[PDB]
Amino acid sequence: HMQELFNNLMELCKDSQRKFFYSDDVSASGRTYRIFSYNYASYSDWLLPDALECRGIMFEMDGEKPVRIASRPMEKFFNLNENPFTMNIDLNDVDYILTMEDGSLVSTYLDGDEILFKSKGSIKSEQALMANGILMNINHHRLRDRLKELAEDGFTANFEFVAPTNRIVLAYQEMKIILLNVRENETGEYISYDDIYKDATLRPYLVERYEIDSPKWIEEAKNAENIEGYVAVMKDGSHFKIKSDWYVSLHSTKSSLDNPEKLFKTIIDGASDDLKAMYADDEYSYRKIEAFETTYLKYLDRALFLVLDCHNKHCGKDRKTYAMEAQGVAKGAGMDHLFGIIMSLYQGYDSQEKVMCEIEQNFLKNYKKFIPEGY
Numbered sequence: 071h072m073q074e075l076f077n078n079l080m081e082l083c084k085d086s087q088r089k090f091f092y093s094d095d096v097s098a099s100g101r102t103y104r105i106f107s108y109n110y111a112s113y114s115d116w117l118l119p120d121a122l123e124c125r126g127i128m129f130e131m132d133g134e135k136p137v138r139i140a141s142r143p144m145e146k147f148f149n150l151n152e153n154p155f156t157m158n159i160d161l162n163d164v165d166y167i168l169t170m171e172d173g174s175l176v177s178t179y180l181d182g183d184e185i186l187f188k189s190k191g192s193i194k195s196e197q198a199l200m201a202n203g204i205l206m207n208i209n210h211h212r213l214r215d216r217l218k219e220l221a222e223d224g225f226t227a228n229f230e231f232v233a234p235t236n237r238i239v240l241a242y243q244e245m246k247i248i249l250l251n252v253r254e255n256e257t258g259e260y261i262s263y264d265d266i267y268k269d270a271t272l273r274p275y276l277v278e279r280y281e282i283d284s285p286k287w288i289e290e291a292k293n294a295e296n297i298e299g300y301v302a303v304m305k306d307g308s309h310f311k312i313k314s315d316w317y318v319s320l321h322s323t324k325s326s327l328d329n330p331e332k333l334f335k336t337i338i339d340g341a342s343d344d345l346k347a348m349y350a351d352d353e354y355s356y357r358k359i360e361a362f363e364t365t366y367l368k369y370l371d372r373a374l375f376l377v378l379d380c381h382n383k384h385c386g387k388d389r390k391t392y393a394m395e396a397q398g399v400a401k402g403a404g405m406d407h408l409f410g411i412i413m414s415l416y417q418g419y420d421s422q423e424k425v426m427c428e429i430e431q432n433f434l435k436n437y438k439k440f441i442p443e444g445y
């Protein structure tokens with residue numbers, strides 16, 4: 071049911087805004103939406119109830135109660151050999167594979183009588199509004215009416231937004247939206263690729279599919295150049311990704327395994343999941359990355375708690391009472407570098423995201439204090 075999904079996602083959000091989090095927003099027709107998403111999660115974090123569904127799913131809210139799943143992107147999936155979810159997979163259970171397109175995800179949602187796009191985290195991001203500019207284009211009037219019909223029937227269409235101005239690694243020639251899959255808002259079930267393919271209105275947009283005889287396509291993908299990789303579709307409908315070493319080496323900081331600052335940078339930037347998959351063959355490198363990952367996730371939880379708890383208890387007091395309490399919390403937690411963080415909050419507290427940026431940047435200034443013991 072919808073409400074137990076909502077309540078389980080809400081549950082995930084009490085832990086830490088480091089981890090799973092939600093954010094409210096209002097569309098141009100004036101109604102509220104809630105997007106559930108995440109910043110950093112570990113393998114144990116992904117085992118909690120419905121955590122794999124907490125990757126951009128959106129509800130329209132009447133205050134605290136949800137009224138409908140307005141949008142439903144793909145479940146979280148991982149690189150092969152990234153963690154136990156993907157480490158003892160029988161490659162013979164692969165049904166087929168899909169070009170992995172290298173842009174930003176956009177998913178449909180119905181707002182009023184309007185069919186619109188949300189990027190993974192927002193209804194108002196630049197990719198979101200750019201994708202809407204495409205949908206409103208007369209040259210996509212026949213795609214848009216189909217997507218509009220799907221959402222009133224409770225299906226979300228998921229595309230990669232790619233463009234010269236949305237460069238990640240791959241250089242596309244032109245700005246487009248590439249339909250990757252369509253999913254049912256209530257069940258999480260997907261319309262089959264073949265069903266989408268034989269709709270000749272949708273087919274022009276649809277990501278390319280390939281057949282495989284046998285798992286040598288894996289190493290060919292790992293060794294290819296000028297591709298991100300492929301998304302594998304299993305006989306049971308689940309997915310995993312496979313990236314080329316070429317993509318991962320450009321998507322990670324250079325020399326990431328030779329330098330602890332660069333490894334922490336890669337982790338902070340959210341690319342250590344692909345790096346460690348790339349180094350799954352090398353148990354020293356894989357477990358080193360994981361140790362740095364654990365260190366930083368553990369620190370971020372601590373730092374965030376201490377900073378936000380301290381700010382919300384003493385916000386508004388005279389500056390040196392506030393300083394006294396900030397002094398206490400930073401010295402008391404063996405984290406004196408946090409004092410400046412807390413005092414930066416004192417004049418102004420915009421988003422809780424800018425707090426994470428300051429914690430994150432500070433961490434990279436003091437990274438040597440934090441290299442896990444033994445490395």
Ligand SMILES: Nc1ncnc2c1ncn2[C@@H]1O[C@H](COP(=O)(O)OP(=O)(O)OP(=O)(O)O)[C@@H](O)[C@H]1O
Nearest residue numbers: 147168169170171172174175230250277301311343
């Ligand atoms: N054929 C495809 N099928 C599904 N997703 C695709 C496909 N091609 C590109 N993508 C994109 O791949 C994304 C997931 O893989 P990617 O490595 O880009 O994730 P990410 O942005 O690093 O997020 P995370 O690692 O947290 O899952 C999807 O959200 C989607 O935008």
Ligand SMILES: [Mg+2]
Nearest residue numbers: 171172173174
């Ligand atoms: Mg991507």
Ligand SMILES: [Mg+2]
Nearest residue numbers: 340341343344
């Ligand atoms: Mg990733």
